[PDB]
């Protein structure tokens, strides 16, 4: 299933890949999960999240 994500909450690196702790638009805010940038089709949310950290 390809589900709509609202925004990113957090980021880490597992096994060399980069996973973002999301917040889904389709699901509840606590039902959020870690999805890697390779599976993320959201460049907007990734950029905005990095802009938030800086």
């Amino acid at each position: 299933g390809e589900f709509v994500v609202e925004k990113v909450l957090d980021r880490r690196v597992v096994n060399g890949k980069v996973e973002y702790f999301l917040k889904w638009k389709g699901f509840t805010d606590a039902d959020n999960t870690w999805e890697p940038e390779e599976n993320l089709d959201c460049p907007e949310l990734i950029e905005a999240f990095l802009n938030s950290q800086k």
Partner: peptide
Amino acid sequence: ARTKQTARKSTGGKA
């Protein structure tokens, strides 16, 4: 006006 972004759930991990 509706900012929807798509993401696919990583069911497993191709190592």
